[PDB]
Nucleic acid binder design. Structure first.
Ligand SMILES: [Mg+2]
Lengths: 79, 1337, 99
DNA sequence: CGTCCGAAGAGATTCAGAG
DNA sequence: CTCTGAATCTCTTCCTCGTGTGGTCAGGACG
RNA sequence: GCAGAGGUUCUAGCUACACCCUCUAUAAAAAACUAAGGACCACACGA
């Protein structure tokens, strides 16, 4: 649970790019079987996504790199 | 998916293409059989089946049967959803002109035909015949021919030519004219025409023709022969009504039109006499134009209940129109409404939410979680479980509510903070609980106040609410940097009670180890809450870079303050809590916490301070009582003295010594003085009268009286209300506004007389009605401000423009209303400012001004700082982040893409409710004196006399800041010289307001030129002085023979030689205007700097701000000199005075027309700078924009609007006004076409011409010159690139008609346009979406 | 107290059907939209405009997604916008959506 | 059984003084 | 005698959300 | 489970937002279950 999102807003300056990146992360959590790297403690997907952003473990660049890598294994799976 | 929409005039072929069929039977459905009629307005054959995939025949009832029409019934079988899209049309027997193009004030039909609107109305009403294809006739091709004269022409002319009547005649005229031929004809007429009015009219007409040729539009398309109908589903009313199925509805108007058309065919096949046919055709046109727009014509059709029945145009425009009802603001689901409750236990981000309300709001989430749990296999089973309200449902509701923000929204959303998200906490009850601190921000009381509760659904939405909408995220109000969650009533009172000192109290004079020991002593009760005790405090400083250093010291304080100290975070110093902590003090404390510690410690501190304030206010028991209020002992004596004084004034009136008016004025003045005296006595009895010993004989201290605690702390009320409660109430105004002679002597505590109560209720009812009109006009102003706003987002990070507005502390002759630091706070400098030490870079060029930086600027005491302004920003369709400055929502430069326009519009509109609906110069303090734009000549006594009209005295202290500024009227003499320090309280300048001086620049003799006694100048004797003084006759008053001659004063020596201006080849002639009395005689030497002749000489309400933003010209404007030059009078009082200004080098480019009655500050000989005032009066913003520049008009409007806001004690940061000003003048006019394709006559947005001229600068061709013009907020929003936003604003019929005529293509891209379309807004998070879309395009 | 998740719509298909004792939803009027616009909020405004109020396909898909547990949004077009388009067409003014 | 009859201001539009 | 600036005449709304009460073309008989 | 019908119940149930199984022309061993449509104007009142 996060009362405020400041740590995120200095993690992501725009605070609207923050919404987009953390929304994509939470979408990956709900739709994909992937789970948040930071442990979940009775927290919804958006809250734990903001928590992951807070630690700096997740950002827009890292998220784009991760999805590109996942598409790479998707291509490699077909061979 | 789909690009920006486009609009154009609909061709009859296009109308037929839209229509799935044609209706001929007026009655829609049978009352006996609910099935729709075969050819009625409600038709399944034309508009699709009534039931989803069920035919009228019933032969087809399945999806596989869909797509196969049933021959027996004749209808197509589909889903009824198609019936909404499917459309029909009516083929009128005769063409009928569309009312919108006809009755509109521009009169597009009339403007095209170049025919007056009255003639068009007459020919449409068949009163007169218009000429069509006259050919070989004496009548012209376009001519209006009345009935009798038409008969005379018909009997006179046996030729095949005839003059047609009705709308079909106008359609024939429209077909006859060639737009292109008329285009070049009108262009050459514009070239030939020498009159501005005629050329303007022909310019409007050629604009119409150019719009017609450019777009795919035909003139005959304005008159529609085929009339489209609304789909049967998109038809209003028509309710089952318990099977009555009867209501007034556009269906009635359609039935009228269809009946008329059917009857018209009945008589056309019958071949009726032409008089009945023309009458019925007029009836049909009336039905059609009533259908299109009811009430547009003089006669308005009424339906049932004797009311004007709804029409198509009425469904579009107005508040009830579909735009504002169902597109701009849409009723939404997942919304819960209930009354408000305090719930102090809640934290800032948490709000109370009833169990049933959260159940209803979160039903889909509950169903999903139930299915995931496996408790209910089906959604129907989940709904049954919810209806049972069994235990497992509550636990599921707990899971979803736990981290899912909900929006709490007060019904009038005046400003941005109106809707704020909260993390709901489930409570047992039926009432929503809102955290006490934010209730002040919501402007919400606890009196049946109700807040809507909306639930975000998507992860984007919940995250969006948590990041932005949540209360803890926005502590600072967007309007001003001051925090908005400041303590308001109870917590502020408790903090004040804690932070107070009593000279004697339990546990006084003992030393305390720390705040913990102070709290332990208070809770044990042995030591009183407020008593002066030395305590040890561990103060932490933020001076270390990103580090806190502990300071331990013994600081004298009260037990209450020491207790409060443990609450505050470490970083804050002890100085803030050491004081009494009034409401302003607590606001400053929270602001410092926000600036130093950060957002999260500020939120924690705010919650903790609210808890402590509530607890210690409850402990205090600060009760209001009758004995708490004290009537002054001096009050009765003051009232007796005032009674004696008013009796004496009455006796003077009886004797006739004093007139009635002066008697009333004296009575009012002495009553006001007595009121002030009794107010002072009451205040002294409140705070001074409190006495309690200090272990000695006696000691005087600040009051602990409850009323004075409430007033002084700022918890509730003000000093004036305390005066009303205990002191004499004061004079109460009559409804007309005149002050009542006898004020209300008795206070509210004492018994109040009946007449006194009546006088009071006069003002009370006046104030209530004023509040009603205030909120109405404030809503209108907020709507206008938003709509001129919302076309502004932060597209570009850095504009990179050096130009910016100059910012200086505002001065009105007294103490500076706003210090420079507050104005420049949060604004990025336009240029690198300089330290008072010369050639020092105190501040870099592009640095943002934070709190420490601004405090440093105060230390150097700079006077003027150049600041980037949104107006100075040259970005197209956007505003630079650096140009805008700090957002004021949070402590950094504004984030890219955020909607500045709506923020500023709401910030301006919000205080509107608080806004009301309705010599000599003395230096305040000792400092250096300065003169700007000054021409000074010394007199015989040696005192400086100004020749320049606009000289301004500036009082500059040792630091260099201009403390005081005073306007100096022309001819005024100041004793103290320039640059000489003036002692405080002494008059620097003195002058006469009634007398308008005429000084002489150089001492010398005078020769009267063109001066004749009794003809041009009439000698008038003065008995007291004993010397007759020549008086210049007024030009209009004096005879025409004396009128043309102009008296002139020439400086000469003793020998009589003319004296030139020193350093100027031009002689030093002086001109004597009318009504000038000259004491000095001809042939008498005149000293320099001495006057020759003694020439005899707004609202603070919301309407003032509305006029300023609408840029209304004042009733009597001030004439401003168009160009810099000398003044000559071409004609003197010839109908109106004529003024000519001409430069020495350039030819005279301007002739000025001035009314005779106006006072002219200008003198003909004296040179006038461009933009200088010619006639003193109200200043028109348009003139400032034309002459003094855009920066000057922006400064003027910002200063004057803020001064209006200053009067009521509400502060709005200047950038909010600045962006609105930028929107107001967004339009521009091209002086010379140049290489640009734009014609000089046409007016285009400044962004387009800016892009065009920079593109030209890219190539060889020079950019076209342009002129910036000011438009009112309603006018600026009304005329913009997108017709949709204008249509949502005002004059929707006008906007849509102009768009359809011009065929203008919307470019979307705006907030309101995207709201109406429903696609993602380019305001917040959607800005990245829109930039990705632009990349895709 | 009038909390409602989903209710019967009107002919303009605006689901709340006016604030009434009968079940319905509160109005999110013009000033509320201005408030969201002033905020850096766009997705929630888009929901209130389309998927919560007058997007039949949008509403059905949103309900199915929420009961599925995945909160996804499909913009579509407000039915009120199509109502406005049809009404302007009835006036004889051609208004069309560019592709 | 179905079927035909105040107020405030802005803008256009007259309007009219003056060479 | 043809426009000038002025006075008059015509559009266009004039807050913003609740909650309760009521009243709403009405064709009418006839092949 | 996407075009239809049948089945143990209860007229009818083929995903209609919708709940189980079968197949492409044939009807039953079987328990939790079912409904998707409707305006304006006036008055008063709260903010
Ligand atoms: Mg209230």
């Amino acid at each position: 649970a996060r009362v405020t999102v400041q740590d995120a807003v200095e993690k992501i300056g725009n605070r609207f790019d923050l919404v987009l990146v953390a929304a994509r992360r939470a979408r990956q959590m709900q739709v994909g079987g992937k789970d948040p790297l930071v442990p979940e403690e009775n927290d919804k997907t958006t809250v734990i996504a903001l928590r992951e952003i807070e630690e700096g473990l997740i950002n827009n660049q890292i998220l784009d790199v991760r999805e590109r890598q996942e598409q790479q294994e998707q291509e490699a799976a077909e061979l | 998916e789909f690009d920006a929409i486009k609009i154009a005039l609909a061709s009859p072929d296009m109308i037929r293409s839209w229509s799935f069929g044609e209706v001929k039977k007026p009655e829609t459905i049978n009352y006996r059989t609910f099935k729709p009629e075969r050819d009625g307005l409600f038709c399944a054959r034309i508009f699709g089946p009534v039931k989803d995939y069920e035919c009228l025949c019933g032969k087809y009832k399945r999806l596989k049967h869909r797509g196969v029409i049933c021959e027996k019934c004749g209808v197509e079988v589909t889903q009824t959803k198609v019936r909404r899209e499917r459309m029909g049309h009516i083929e009128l027997a005769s063409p009928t002109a569309h009312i919108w193009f006809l009755k509109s004030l521009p009169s597009r039909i009339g403007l095209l035909l170049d025919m007056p609107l009255r003639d068009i109305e007459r020919v449409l009403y068949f009163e007169s015949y218009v000429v069509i294809e006259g050919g070989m006739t004496n009548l012209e091709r376009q001519q209006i021919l009345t009935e009798e004269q038409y008969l005379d022409a018909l009997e006179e002319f046996g030729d095949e030519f005839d003059a047609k009547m009705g709308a079909e005649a106008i359609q024939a005229l429209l077909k006859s004219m060639d737009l292109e031929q008329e285009c070049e004809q009108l262009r050459e007429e514009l070239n030939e025409t020498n009159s501005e009015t005629k050329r303007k009219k022909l310019t409007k007409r050629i604009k119409l023709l150019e719009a017609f040729v450019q777009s795919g539009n035909k003139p005959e398309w304005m008159i529609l022969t085929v009339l489209p109908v609304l789909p049967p589903d998109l038809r209003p009313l028509v309710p089952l009504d318990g099977g009555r199925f009867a209501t007034s509805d556009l269906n009635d108007l359609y039935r009228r039109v269809i009946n008329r058309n059917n009857r018209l065919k009945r008589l056309l096949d019958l071949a009726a006499p032409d008089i009945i046919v023309r009458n019925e055709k007029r009836m049909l046109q009336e039905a059609v134009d009533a259908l299109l727009d009811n009430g547009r014509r003089g006669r308005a059709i009424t339906g049932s209940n004797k009311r004007p029945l709804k029409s198509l145009a009425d469904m579009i425009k107005g508040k009830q129109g579909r735009f504002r009802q169902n597109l701009l603001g849409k009723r939404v689901d997942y919304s819960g409404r209930s009354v408000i409750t305090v719930g102090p236990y809640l934290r800032l981000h948490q709000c109370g939410l009833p169990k049933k309300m959260a159940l209803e709001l979160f039903k889909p989430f509950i169903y999903g979680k139930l299915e995931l749990r496996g408790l209910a296999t089906t959604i129907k089973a989940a709904k049954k479980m919810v209806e049972r309200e069994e235990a497992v449902v509550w636990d599921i509701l707990d899971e979803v509510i736990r981290e899912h923000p909900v929006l709490l929204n007060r019904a009038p959303t005046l400003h941005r903070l109106g809707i704020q998200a909260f993390e709901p906490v489930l409570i047992e009850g039926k009432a929503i609980q809102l955290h006490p601190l934010v209730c002040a921000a919501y402007n919400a009381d606890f009196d049946g106040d109700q807040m809507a509760v909306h639930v975000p659904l998507t992860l984007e939405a919940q995250l969006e609410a948590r990041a932005l909408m949540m209360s803890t995220n926005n502590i600072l109000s967007p309007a001003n940097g001051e925090p908005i969650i400041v303590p308001s009533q109870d917590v502020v009172l408790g903090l004040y009670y804690m932070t107070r000192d009593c000279v004697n109290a339990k546990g006084e004079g003992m030393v305390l180890t720390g705040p913990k020991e102070a709290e332990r002593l208070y809770r044990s009760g042995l030591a009183s809450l407020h008593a002066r005790v030395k305590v040890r405090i561990t103060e932490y400083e933020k001076d270390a870079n990103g580090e806190l250093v502990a300071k331990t010291s013994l600081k004298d304080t009260t037990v209450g303050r020491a207790i409060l100290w443990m609450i505050v975070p470490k970083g804050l110093p002890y100085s803030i809590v050491n004081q009494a902590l009034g409401k302003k003090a607590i606001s400053k404390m929270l602001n410092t916490c926000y600036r130093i510690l950060g957002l999260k410690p500020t939120v924690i501190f705010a919650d903790q301070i609210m808890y402590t304030g509530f607890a210690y206010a409850a402990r205090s028991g600060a009760s209001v009582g009758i004995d708490d209020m004290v009537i002054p002992e001096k009050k009765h004596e003051i009232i007796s003295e005032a009674e004696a004084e008013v009796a004496e004034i009455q006796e003077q009136f009886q004797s006739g010594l004093v007139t009635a008016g002066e008697r009333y004025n004296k009575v009012i003045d002495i009553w006001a003085a007595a009121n002030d005296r009794v107010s002072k006595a009451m205040m002294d009895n409140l705070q001074t009268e409190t006495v309690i010993n200090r272990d000695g004989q006696e000691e005087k201290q600040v009051s602990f009286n409850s009323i004075y605690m409430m007033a002084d702390s700022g918890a509730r009320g003000s000093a004036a209300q305390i005066r009303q409660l205990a002191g004499m109430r004061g004079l109460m105004a009559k409804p007309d506004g005149s002050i009542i002679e006898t004020p209300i002597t008795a206070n509210f505590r004492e018994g109040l007389n009946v007449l006194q109560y009546f006088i009071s209720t006069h003002g009370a009812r006046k104030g209530l009605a004023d509040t009603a009109l205030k909120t109405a006009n404030s809503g209108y102003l907020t709507r206008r401000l938003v709509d001129v706003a919302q076309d502004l987002v932060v597209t570009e990070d850095d504009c990179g423009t050096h130009e910016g507005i100059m910012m200086t502390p505002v001065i009105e002759g007294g103490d500076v209303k706003e210090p420079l630091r507050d104005r420049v706070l949060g604004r990025v400098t336009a240029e690198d400012v300089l330290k008072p030490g010369t050639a020092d870079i105190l501040v870099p060029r592009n640095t943002l001004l934070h709190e420490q930086w601004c405090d440093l600027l105060e230390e150097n005491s700079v006077d003027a700082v150049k600041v980037r302004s949104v107006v100075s920003c040259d970005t197209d369709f956007g505003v630079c982040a650096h140009c805008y400055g700090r957002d004021l929502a949070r402590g950094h430069i504004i984030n890219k893409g955020e909607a500045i326009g709506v923020i500023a519009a709401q910030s301006i509109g919000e205080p509107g409710t608080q806004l009301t609906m309705r010599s000599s110069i003395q230096v305040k303090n000792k400092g250096s004196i300065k003169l700007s734009n000054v021409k000074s000549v010394v007199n015989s006594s040696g005192k400086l006399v100004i020749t320049s009209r606009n000289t301004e005295l500036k009082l500059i202290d040792e630091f260099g800041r201009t403390k005081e500024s005073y306007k100096v009227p022309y001819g005024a003499v100041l004793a103290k010289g320039d640059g000489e320090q003036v002692a405080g309280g002494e008059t620097v300048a003195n002058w006469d307001p009634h007398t308008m001086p005429v000084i002489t620049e150089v001492s010398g003799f005078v020769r009267f030129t063109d001066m004749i006694d009794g003809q041009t100048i009439t000698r008038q004797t003065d008995e007291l002085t004993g010397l007759s003084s020549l008086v210049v006759l007024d030009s209009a008053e004096r005879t025409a023979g004396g009128k043309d001659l102009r008296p002139a004063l020439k400086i000469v020596d003793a020998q009589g030689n003319d004296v030139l201006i020193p350093g100027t080849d031009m002689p030093a002639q002086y001109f004597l205007p009318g009504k000038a009395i000259v004491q000095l005689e001809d042939g008498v030497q005149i000293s320099s700097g001495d006057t020759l002749a003694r020439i005899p000489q707004i609202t603070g309400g919301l309407p003032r701000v509305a006029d300023l933003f609408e840029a209304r010209r004042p009733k009597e404007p001030a004439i401003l000199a168009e160009i810099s030059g000398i003044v000559s009078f071409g004609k003197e009082t010839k109908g109106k005075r004529r003024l000519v200004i001409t430069p020495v080098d350039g030819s005279d480019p301007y002739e000025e027309m001035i009314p005779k009655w106006r006072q002219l500050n200008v003198f003909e000989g004296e040179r006038v700078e461009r933009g200088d005032v010619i006639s003193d009066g109200p200043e028109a913003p348009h003139d400032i924009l034309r002459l003094r520049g855009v920066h000057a008009v922006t400064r003027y409007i910002v200063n004057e609007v803020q001064d209006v806001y200053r009067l009521q004690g509400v502060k709005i940061n200047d950038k909010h006004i600045e962006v609105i000003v930028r929107q107001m003048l967004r339009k521009a006019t091209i002086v010379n076409a140049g290489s640009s394709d734009f014609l000089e006559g046409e007016q285009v947005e400044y962004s387009r011409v800016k892009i065009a001229n920079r593109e030209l600068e890219a190539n060889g061709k020079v950019g076209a010159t342009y002129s910036r013009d000011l438009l009112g907020i309603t006018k600026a929003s009304l005329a913009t690139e997108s017709f949709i936003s204008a249509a949502s604003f005002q004059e929707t019929t006008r906007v849509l008609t102009e768009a359809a005529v011009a065929g203008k293509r919307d470019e979307l891209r705006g907030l309101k346009e995207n709201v109406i379309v429903g696609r993602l807004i380019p305001a917040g998070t959607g800005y990245a979406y829109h930039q990705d879309r632009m990349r895709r395009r | 107290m009038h909390a409602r998740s989903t209710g019967s719509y009107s002919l303009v298909t605006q689901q709340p059907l006016g604030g009434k004792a009968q079940f319905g939803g509160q109005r999110f009027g013009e000033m509320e939209v201005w408030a969201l616009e002033a905020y850096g909020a766009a997705y929630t405004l888009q929901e209130m405009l389309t998927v919560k109020s007058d997007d039949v396909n949008g509403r059905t898909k949103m309900y199915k997604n929420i009961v599925d547990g995945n909160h996804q949004m499909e913009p579509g077009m407000p039915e009120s916008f199509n109502v406005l388009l049809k009404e302007i067409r009835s006036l004889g003014i051609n208004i069309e959506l560019e592709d």
